[PDB]
Symmetry: C4
Subunit: 31 residues, 4 copies
Amino acid sequence: MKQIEDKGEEILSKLYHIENELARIKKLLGE
Amino acid sequence: MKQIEDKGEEILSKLYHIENELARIKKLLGE
Amino acid sequence: MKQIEDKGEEILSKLYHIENELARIKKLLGE
Amino acid sequence: MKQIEDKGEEILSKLYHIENELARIKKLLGE
Ligand SMILES: [Cl-]
Ligand SMILES: [Cl-]
């Protein structure tokens, strides 16, 4: 189903957002 | 598919939670 | 499909793991 | 389903990444 495929996409998009958050936090922490 | 939908909802729920927890951490570190 | 349902489950399980990591990090940071 | 499978793989890939990034942060904070 394309509804499921589309949900996969949305999920992935949230994971990229999380990775951007982490990139910021790693710099705040001087990593 | 109704079950997959429930798993899709639970997953997005958790993702938003994680995003918000990381946003609170970034906010606190920036202070 | 049950293959997709089972993948949903695995994904969720990783999100719980992430939440546990975060719980630890929030305490390290005195939140 | 082959496409959903590729999205499932990309998602798990990202999750492992995030888990490892958070593990490195917890390790560094505990030092
Ligand atoms: Cl995509
Ligand atoms: Cl489950």
